Curated annotation (Swiss-Prot):
First-to-last residue of the parent protein present: 41 to 251 of 251
Keywords: Glycosyltransferase, Host-virus interaction, NAD, Nucleotidyltransferase, Secreted, Signal, Transferase
Designated name of the protein: Mono-ADP-ribosyltransferase C3
Stretches that traverse the bilayer: none
Lineage: Viruses, Duplodnaviria, Heunggongvirae, Uroviricota, Caudoviricetes
Family, similarity comment: To exoenzymes 3 of C.limosum and C.botulinum C phage, and to S.aureus ediN.
Domain (TR mART core) ranges: 7-206
Assigned GO CC terms: extracellular region
MF GO annotations: NAD+-protein mono-ADP-ribosyltransferase activity; nucleotidyltransferase activity
Positions bearing the site annotation: Transition state stabilizer: 174
Catalytic activity: L-asparaginyl-[protein] + NAD(+) = N(4)-(ADP-D-ribosyl)-L-asparaginyl-[protein] + nicotinamide + H(+)
Localization (cell): Secreted
Subunit structure: Monomer. Interacts with human RALA.
Length: 211
């Protein structure tokens, strides 16, 4: 129809080759790579601070400010040449503290009532994320244990970096997205296998554009 087409990697060997190919052309500086390595080693803490302070970094320790600004600007060199689907998994808290202990039933499946509340709260609305967004080119094993799977539709030209080869601690086929990014949740449904929430969203972009 009038919908756009987003590619999805289904072969890990090619996803790795494709990502490696993009990486080879970034021309990242030594300090930019170190910033990315540092991010992979303290992602939880950095994103936690970003959320806590709503994206304002002036109060962060000087060293962290430098790291964040380096990472922010590194995206000027990292764009995806294709419309691509990116994946990530999340725990109930992602939907809000109110679901942290209400989304799942004692058997693995997810309560339908809580799920219905999740839709009214997020379906057909823009969502702003203060932290950076770690994703993978494929639905890697690192997930499949999380109750929430999000599929982001990222358009050609968007800021997105394949950091899998930059850090020993990056996730498998990890594609990092800029912080302070907004996306629109287009669809929310249960997995057809024993309940699970599959979220499909269109990535709109980031407000962090240095230069």
């Amino acid at each position: 129809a009038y919908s756009n087409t987003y590619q999805e990697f289904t072969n890990i060997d090619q996803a790795k080759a494709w990502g490696n190919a993009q990486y080879k052309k970034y021309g990242l500086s030594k300090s930019e790579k170190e910033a990315i390595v540092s991010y992979t080693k303290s992602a939880s803490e950095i994103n936690g601070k970003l959320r806590q302070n709503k994206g304002v970094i002036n109060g962060f320790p000087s060293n962290l400010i430098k790291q964040v600004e380096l990472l922010d600007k590194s995206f000027n060199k990292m764009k995806t040449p294709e419309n691509i689907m990116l994946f990530r998994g999340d725990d109930p808290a992602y939907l809000g503290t109110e679901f942290q202990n209400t989304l799942l039933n004692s058997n693995g499946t997810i309560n339908k009532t809580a799920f219905e509340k999740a839709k009214a709260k997020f379906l057909n609305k823009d969502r702003l994320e203060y932290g950076y967004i770690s994703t993978s080119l494929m639905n890697v094993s690192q997930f499949a244990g999380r109750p929430i799977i999000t599929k982001f539709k990222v358009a050609k030209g968007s800021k997105a970096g394949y950091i899998d080869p930059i850090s020993a601690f990056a996730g498998q086929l990890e594609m990092l997205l800029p912080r302070h990014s907004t996306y629109h949740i287009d669809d929310m449904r249960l997995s057809s296998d024993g309940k699970q929430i599959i979220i499909t969203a269109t990535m709109m972009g980031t407000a962090i554009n240095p230069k």
